[PDB]
Design a protein around this ligand. Structure first.
Ligand SMILES: Nc1nc2c(ncn2[C@@H]2O[C@H](COP(=O)(O)OP(=O)(O)NP(=O)(O)O)[C@@H](O)[C@H]2O)c(=O)[nH]1
Ligand SMILES: Nc1nc2c(ncn2[C@@H]2O[C@H](COP(=O)(O)OP(=O)(O)NP(=O)(O)O)[C@@H](O)[C@H]2O)c(=O)[nH]1
Ligand SMILES: Nc1nc2c(ncn2[C@@H]2O[C@H](COP(=O)(O)OP(=O)(O)NP(=O)(O)O)[C@@H](O)[C@H]2O)c(=O)[nH]1
Ligand SMILES: Nc1nc2c(ncn2[C@@H]2O[C@H](COP(=O)(O)OP(=O)(O)NP(=O)(O)O)[C@@H](O)[C@H]2O)c(=O)[nH]1
Ligand SMILES: Nc1nc2c(ncn2[C@@H]2O[C@H](COP(=O)(O)OP(=O)(O)NP(=O)(O)O)[C@@H](O)[C@H]2O)c(=O)[nH]1
Lengths: 417, 414, 420, 416
């Protein structure tokens, strides 16, 4: 019926309802200041319910996340942006804003040590340094990796040498015996000794840490604490940047930071006025994050608002596993479909099914149940065109994305010389 | 008017939907009852359990709070897995118990306090060391329980039922010392004689090093959940914790919930007993070893379990698909609060659960879902479909946010 | 029932509602025709914006993938585009190879001298290219070994470089010939010094790494030496085109080497300097024939800026599935916005179904009114397509069309192979 | 309709078209000499796109392959025939023809050593001797088996003793240490030493070679080369025969020969006039061939034409794996369905689906999409009746197979 691609109908019975772009825009418009999603103002209550932007590469995920960041800043919200090539940084970065990039002159000095405040914070952040294993077996090695990491990094802290270079030496360079000796006195003293199984466990933990820690070590150090930054209202915005050719090298470090924010907001003091955004341009690009799940379910009070991008259902599935991936996607109440490749009929089907069906009375009438949006309609979407379906009881609408231009108020990258 | 689909001439068979009010009159009984989203719960549906499935922020709290409240007004006892002490601060009385290693008001506890017979050693070893996520992980877990039960059994024998002693032995003492200490116990030989035997020991250590931590640092006392259950005048138990420590306390919290699950099976036959078990988020605990039997053999002890879920993939990931199905299946009453449109599989599951009906229209026999997956995806907050156990129709009802005054501080730093 | 004749193979319809729309060949050709110079796909001018969105050409053997890729290469050359061609039996080389063009074939007299050492420029480039030399393992277990093999490879080759002997022969000797102890000793001082020692597990891991490197390195070693760098070649505008050739009977022997070169390009374009004028094509005649490339996915997602345009061929969905795994293969195919279906065997109903579904359905209104949802192209229509006939469905909002492939003839301006 | 078993229709819209036996025979008939498939002349361009004949046992797979072979010989094509019990050899074998059977008086002397011409040929044919493992794990062992085989066999050749008996001794009889010693100087010197894993690997390689090599050793010695035979125009035809009760024992050797042909044709010199047939009576009966895939895809210019038989989709699936078996079946552009058991509904469905559906317009007007051939129609096919669907755009046809009689121009077997 105009805003509905299929045959017009006489009466809408139940299910997903689709409305015109403008019609939606008036429906979601509210008294208070709001952020916009592809020109449509986002319902204030849908913000802490999170947003998922699914779409093939080049369809407008950037234009959209850029606009969402912009309107959020104009309202004065704070935010963390996993920002590739410092694009968002060059457009919205102010002078009081933070930068995390081991190769950027302007980056702050950091070590996970800087986040430890209580004893339970050791495993908490070991979980962030060493993300979840892709497979059950890889997770088993990871757990030994965390054991070795936490007990070793704990002792180094005790003995006044919370050195990352030291922790790395111990965990991956020192001989098996030396390490064993250093571990004496720690909960790990006996756990990694006594059988071939125990030695194997230690070897596995070594390999893990040798894989995860490199970047953390070469990370410029300082006293910066993501925890303290979150608690500081006058703290700026955090931009996690990196050059694309190094994406794979920094995957474990960047996932570390993203996870740190995820656990940390759970510890921030009860503050109703806080509004923190978490921008993860490509969710399936980070490692299987340990705390993301809880952050997406218990971050309302902290005022957490997560926006994530995805392309094919198989990407997240491969990283988190099918079961765990479904749960992850399910935690984003608000969805945006940007149209994908016709070569990916499975995700187009998944997106079509998510947008949902409606039961209509068409034209002796007739009741018909049909997809509001056909997989084919998603496959044939032109660029900068999106279907916006906000959390809760709202109708969805096909809306165009407009490319607004933003001036570069800072260099995206600054060589670490 | 209440069936979202096209009106029909005649209902033939299947799931029947009725108006909120119509149902409230149908389910209302003479005796005192508790309410579910404003609907009086059939007295016989209480021990058949209730499952509340819904996306985050849909009203799972408002509903569980309501149930708890109406259950208290009726004088029913209850154990509440209460995050951030929300429930505690609203309904906690002075005679009520608090379990939180980090709250000044907590009772002192150790699983030792629940041992009364010999068979209680494995029974609660299963509570301390929950079921493994995988078949391999469970193999380790069982080694961990052997190590646990035999070491903790000797420590009790020699008059030193110390959790710090148990922890030292099982994860700190060297292999040989431990081996020595185990001599004379059923585990004397089992963990010796081959590389395999030493491997099983190594696996049991790791498990116990993962599970025991919080049990050790837990404040000491002679509090017994078993005894608490047998005491009529005992208050209500509030298991609380600060969210940023949820992961850390996951094994401990699961321990307590499980303990309740096995223990109620040993309570003396008491027809007058009405005990509620509130697990805000079922998939958030570990794979509980005794929950299954509790949901099947707790009628006689008066057990009433209420649990919340979000995505079917959550429970599935923790219990495994086969086991998770059996678990969800044990809850006779269901409440659907509406989920994300990004989770079509669960919405489909809930739609299917609500069921289909065969209807006759303007004739035409039609089979259709009473509630479409889409209708559940588009439900507004504080709106739920209530489908009680047995032969009852379902109804879409609105949840009302009743306000409760804080009659106690949610947390009290120790 | 007007619409649906000479375009849609099904019953003609009264009104098109939604979904995939099919148009005639000619009608598509004017629709996609643009002002700027364009390349052609089966005679159909390709949308300039569809180029960096990549193209996937699926079809049974002998249906015309060659005629198509050859045509694409040709028109791309006429426009002055640069390109890297995975060229079996030097066919493309013999038709389009010029004198300034590069050749990579360890057994061709004209090949350039290469070693992955030639691509190392920063420290992060060691693991980066260890990923290229040692592709992803087919199974989770095989990948575990692969990682050990990359650890051994990167630390050993790193030291050899430090000590001024960046030798492939030396690297090969150390990693697969020297005894466990000697290697262990050479490794002292490097990150792997302790990692490969201390338990049976550690020694097992070293043994696994040795096996992998003994499997991948062979051809790298026998590869004629030189200072040629694929990275530097990419940065050089006047650099010609790169033809990676090989004789078919050696395909399996060079599979690991060739996969390394293709991956080298896939990571390297990510480091090229921002140049809006760059147009680089990557022709991989048969994607499932190379190994599970480590950098492909990111290149198909982050190469627009570098001007990367990938063109790949496939036959049965099970081929790429077996190499990359089902999930990872889905993601990969999904990264190609444009599709060309050439028709498969009737003995492969699963793939014909996959292609039919990818081509999509349409919802139409026909007479007797009835709304009908149906596949624009049936699996049977694809199974029954004659040779040199294809369905072209460009990226974005464009209709698809059935077009005939014309066999243009190209004179041999160079011998396909030279030497032994 | 007299061709289509379902309800006649007013108009054909799209999909698979079915035509009468005769109608198809006129359609496919060509000017050039052709071979026939169940009486139907096979399109010349469909020959190098291969032919797959699916059918239950006793439906006529033999009558058909026999017919194909005969008409192929009448045209003068050369061929390799995996020939059970020497049936094909006894009807078409001439005197210049080759026979490979370790237990037949008339066999040629062979060793894989006879196929080595360049260095890359060692692994190439170690792949032929040691076929692909049924499981990922079994293949891991097989890869160690090939490492052990190629390095050992290579040295033995280097030192002037290319003995199959020497190779077998070294790889499965010599003690671990001696072997290790012998391997010194070869690429495998260190690879199989240094840890328990290294020793485990060696042990795996021994087991594998001990399973595969047996028949290779006991195989009569000679200087015959399948490679050279292929390059020789005047070379006859190759009949790979064996008595059925020994099928399991010879499975690894016969699979080796088939694979050698599969890789070797990739090295033959460019010859547009060559027409070489590869008859594999039952594809799932050989091992997971390492080079079949590439042969079914890159053998056009060598003139390879492959004809294979199958019964149930589960057979090939179990040997090659579901993914790899689909890829394999998909590489045969032409298909023949002979009718299967009603106890194998899945394969009948796979064949029905492969045959395809059509969208038709019938008078009640109704557009209907339906299987041209129902699973049930294939389950109920009488013997010697088949559906012939050539590669490309041709209709399919239900045709009868005629049992032509061929005189025995040679004994099937000759005890040695
Ligand atoms: N002509 C033009 N189009 C632009 C420009 N910037 C953005 N666009 C439009 O926006 C689209 C890309 O959207 P975007 O959200 O950046 O895509 P992405 O997948 O996030 N990133 P990328 O484009 O790098 O792959 C293009 O298809 C184009 O239509 C520009 O400078 N010129
Ligand atoms: N089925 C149907 N027929 C109707 C309706 N209203 C009027 N009719 C009358 O019935 C005729 C069609 O009946 P119908 O049962 O659909 O015919 P059919 O196509 O043979 N049956 P089917 O669709 O089950 O295959 C129309 O020509 C019309 O005159 C209605 O709502 N449903
Ligand atoms: N105005 C108001 N609404 C409330 C209050 N508590 C809950 N609600 C309503 O109920 C919804 C959340 O329900 P609730 O049961 O707390 O959700 P939950 O998932 O169990 N926990 P949470 O709300 O912390 O995310 C909110 O979206 C809001 O509409 C309150 O104190 N005031
Ligand atoms: N006359 C002729 N036809 C050709 C030529 N190249 C390809 N063809 C035609 O196109 C078909 C094969 O197409 P092609 O794209 O080469 O197929 P491919 O699968 O990529 N490779 P191949 O042809 O080697 O099997 C042949 O059957 C033939 O009809 C040529 O040089 N001359
Ligand atoms: N009268 C007759 N019928 C034959 C002869 N050879 C085959 N047939 C017919 O064809 C059927 C077997 O066909 P065939 O192609 O040999 O089957 P196969 O499965 O390849 N081998 P087999 O028959 O050994 O099981 C027999 O059941 C019979 O009806 C023959 O010499 N005489």
């Amino acid at each position: 019926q105009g805003e509905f691609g299929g045959a017009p109908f006489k009466r809408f019975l139940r299910g997903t309802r689709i409305v015109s772009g403008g019609k939606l825009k008036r429906m979601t418009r509210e008294k208070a200041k709001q952020v916009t999603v592809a020109g449509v103002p986002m319902p204030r209550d849908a913000e802490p319910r999170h947003l998922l932007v699914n779409g093939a590469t080049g369809t407008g995920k950037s234009v959209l996340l850029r606009e969402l960041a912009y309107t959020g800043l104009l309202r004065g919200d704070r935010m963390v942006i996993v920002d590739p090539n410092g694009d968002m940084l060059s457009k919205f970065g102010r002078d009081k804003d933070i930068i995390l990039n081991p190769y950027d002159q302007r980056t702050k000095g950091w070590s996970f040590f800087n986040e430890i405040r209580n004893d339970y914070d050791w495993q908490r952040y070991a979980l962030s340094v060493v993300p979840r294993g892709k497979t059950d077996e890889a997770e088993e090695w990871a757990s030994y990796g965390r054991l070795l990491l936490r007990e070793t990094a704990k002792k180094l802290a005790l003995i006044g040498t919370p050195s990352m270079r030291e922790l790395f030496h111990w965990t991956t360079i020192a001989t098996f015996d030396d390490l064993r000796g250093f571990l004496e006195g720690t909960l790990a003293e006996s756990l990694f000794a006594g059988s071939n199984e125990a030695s194997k466990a230690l070897t596995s933990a070594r390999f893990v840490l040798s894989d995860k820690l490199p970047e953390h070590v070469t990370m410029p150090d300082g006293d910066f604490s993501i925890r303290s930054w979150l608690e500081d209202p006058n703290g700026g915005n955090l931009f996690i940047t990196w050059r694309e050719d190094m994406g794979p090298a920094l995957r474990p470090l960047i996932s570390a930071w993203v996870d740190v924010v995820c656990t940390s907001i759970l510890s921030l003091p009860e503050e109703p006025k806080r509004r923190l955004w978490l921008f993860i341009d490509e969710l399936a690009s980070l490692e299987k994050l340990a705390s993301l799940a809880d952050a997406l379910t218990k971050g309302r009070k902290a005022g957490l608002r997560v926006v994530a991008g995805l392309q094919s259902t198989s990407q997240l599935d491969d990283v988190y596993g099918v079961k765990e991936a479904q749960t992850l996607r399910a935690s984003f109440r608000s969805l945006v479909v940007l149209g994908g490749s016709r070569t990916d009929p499975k995700t187009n089907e998944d997106m079509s099914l998510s947008l949902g069906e409606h039961e209509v009375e068409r034209d002796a009438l007739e009741r018909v149940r049909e997809r509001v949006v056909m997989p084919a309609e998603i496959a044939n979407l032109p660029d900068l065109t999106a279907y916006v379906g906000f959390a809760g009881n709202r109708p969805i609408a096909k809306v165009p994305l407009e490319i607004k231009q933003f001036a570069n108020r800072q260099p995206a990258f600054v060589e670490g010389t």
